[model samples]
Target: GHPSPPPEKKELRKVAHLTGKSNSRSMPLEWEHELGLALLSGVKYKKGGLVINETGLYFVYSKVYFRGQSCNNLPLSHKVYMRNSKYPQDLVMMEGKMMSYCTTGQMWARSSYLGAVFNLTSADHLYVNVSELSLVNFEESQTFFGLYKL
Candidate 1:
């Protein structure tokens, strides 16, 4: 029998990495355009969310940098969430939280990272959120969100 045709080159799975501070307390987190790995066709960046166009499993992740000149033990929370037509409520896929993380009344800095694999569907929208917007540092390397199909 003729040898099976060489396997077609797999199209790079949809991927995107966004870096920046998301200013809204409840709104979607926005991304910095000039950061790390980004492949737009695999995922769509819209508003403050990564909109999924191809349905499959994806590895989603996000990191937030937090610091302040003086610490007050403000609780820090970071979460990756998803929304779609299938459900009216937004689902929390991953989350990170810190309390009593720094010495009181002292300069301090910290970061939170969340990542996991999830079953995503076409038209599913994903985004990141934090407890306090003002504490977030918008540096490209320090704060970012990204995901890729698995």
Candidate 2:
């Protein structure tokens, strides 16, 4: 029998960037090929919302790891937050839990953008936190998270 590593799994195509509402559906104005990670500063959602072309299945996950060295000068400047478009302003879907380990070490916070299958429409909005000077690299880079249909 042939013995070799299997082929790499295909990544989902996700679109990113915030702009005015989209009207047409025949073509996409902007899109990214496939990004495994990204470094974003001041990562915030747009005032409008997210544009979901095809309604299918999607999932979201995030992991934030930090070192106390970075938190020294800035006592409490960095934060990880998530909110739902369905929820109103000033209403957060969930905030990361705090840790009590004492040391100039690593701290982590993780949450699911969504676990269950999600069927999206044309336009949807999702925002996440971005600390100043923080290096953010993930499945989303100026585009949607992981992969999804357009």
Candidate 3:
């Protein structure tokens, strides 16, 4: 007879906490009224495509707020990368561009992909950052990002 499987142990999972303010006249959202989550940090995008069990695209979207007055002032940008436990620097997809202090209702990079499609594995790493422009305000928006299949 097969031995009984060990009882499954359950543990509490910690959720990421976020703080956001409604898009205001000062700085409106780049997207539509339903901008998902606002004024937070992290990447948020509609994942697409489907594989064996995983469906949707592997995306890394993020946002930041710049208070200093300069419309032409370049916004913070991020360098995207992927890694795994077994391999070092598995992939460097693309460098992400983030902007601020511009009028709202603008699409930063619509349908613009820096690199090619990345086949997802059990282990992968993606990273983005704005090493410069420290004066800007950025909230990891992904904490409130919504995921869907389409």
Candidate 4:
């Protein structure tokens, strides 16, 4: 311990922000890492998760764009999950649910945003999932996932 005070030291911020990718084709949505305006620093993007290489406190956030050519009042949802080596289960760090969100056959368009803070560990993986692919829009700015060290 310093016993008195600690000097300010320079450190690189660990951050990763990803945009949506088209033609997801499944419940497990996909994101772009090294494309468009996507960014990364001290982090890794795998098949779907934002793999953590450093253990610390982090602020995780995501925004999902939902829409349909003709609304059918279908239930929709977005979830951000966390899983590590020890447990083969997923922890829903953040989630949002949408039901009867719009009028029927009106081409409804909406979005859901989820953000929160958590204690993350090395090798921890984060993934974003949607209720379905047909009800989602894959625009870069409309859908995104980001996390930064605090």
Quantify how close model 1 is to the true structure by its C-alpha RMSD in Å: 4.9
* Residue runs of model 3 more than 4 Å from their true location after superposition: 1-57, 64-76, 85-87, 96-117, 140-150
- lDDT of candidate model 4 versus the reference: 0.85
Report, for every candidate in turn, its global Cα lDDT versus the true structure: 0.80, 0.33, 0.34, 0.85
User: What lDDT is reached at residue 27 by model 3?
Assistant: 20
TM-score winner, 1 or 4: 4
> Model 4 — TM-score against the truth?
0.89
Per-residue lDDT tens digits of candidate 2, residues 1-150? 663342422233453432211231211111222233432222223432234544455443333333333322332122222334664453332334334433344343322232223555434444434342232223232213322332
TM of each candidate vs. truth: 0.85, 0.38, 0.36, 0.89
Model 1: per-residue lDDT, tens digit, 1-150?
564342522445468788775454545677765435434546777878899987888898898999998999889999999889876599888998999899888999998888888999999999888888888888777888888888
Best by TM-score: 4
Writing each residue's lDDT as its tens digit, candidate 4 over 1-150 gives 653222332255688989988866745667888878899988988888899987889999999999898888788889999889775588888899999788877978999999989999999999999887777788898989999988
Which residue runs does candidate 4 get wrong by more than 4 Å?
A: 1-11
Who wins the lDDT comparison? Answer: 4
Q: Candidate 3's residue-wise lDDT over 70-140, tens digit each?
A: 34545545444555565584455556565553555442321112433444453344433333433344343
* Candidate 2 clashes between residue pairs 3 or more apart in a chain or in different chains: 12-147, 15-144, 16-143, 37-138, 38-137, 38-138, 50-124, 60-113
Overlapping backbone residue pairs in candidate 2 total 8
- Alpha-carbon shift of residue 142 in model 1 (angstroms): 0.4
Candidate closer to the true structure by lDDT (higher is better), 2 or 3: 3
